[PDB]
């Protein structure tokens, strides 16, 4: 079934290959303030309370759709700041807490996040 996990992987890869993915918090900050965002997702595994609270306030300001991933390293692997190392499993994964989609890039299966938007709207 086309769930939000596989569709999220798809849209994040598509954003990456078209250079429309701003990884981090400083880049997420300036991108969110510039009103050039399309989607934001933060990781549950953040011990810092100010980070999560700031992301909630900033996302709430422009009311963009929100997703969770529940693992800092998994989200880092998804966004693509890693080295493949001749296999599907990669090594030396860098945690990425927040990432904002500057551009979808290619309109392939982009509807699924909007489907999830209606699911939250419900």
């Amino acid at each position: 079934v086309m769930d939000v996990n596989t569709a999220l992987q798809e849209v994040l890869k598509t954003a990456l290959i078209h250079d429309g993915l701003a990884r981090g918090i400083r880049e997420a900050a300036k991108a969110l303030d510039k009103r050039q965002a399309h989607l934001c997702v933060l990781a549950s595994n953040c011990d810092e309370p100010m980070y999560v609270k700031l992301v909630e306030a900033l996302c709430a300001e422009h009311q963009i759709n929100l997703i969770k991933v529940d693992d800092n390293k998994k989200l880092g692997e998804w966004v693509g700041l890693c080295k493949i190392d001749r296999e599907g499993k990669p090594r030396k994964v860098v945690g990425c807490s927040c990432v904002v989609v500057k551009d979808y890039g290619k309109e392939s299966q982009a509807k699924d996040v909007i489907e999830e938007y209606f699911k939250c709207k419900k």
Binding site: A29, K30, K34, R35, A57
Partner: protein, 53 residues
């Protein structure tokens, strides 16, 4: 001797209430923050230096 750049743990310019100003320029603004020194204000990427007494 060479300069060794100092590291900061996180960025805290917010509380939505911003705690610094933003560079009034064509190229940059609304997201780039102007340094608030003890006397002056200064934008890093552009060098606009609003002195204030």
């Amino acid at each position: 001797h060479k300069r060794k750049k100092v590291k900061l743990a996180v960025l805290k310019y917010y509380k939505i209430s911003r705690l610094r100003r933003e560079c009034p320029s064509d190229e940059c603004g609304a997201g780039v923050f102007m340094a608030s020194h003890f006397d002056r204000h200064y934008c890093g990427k552009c060098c606009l230096t609003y002195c204030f007494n």
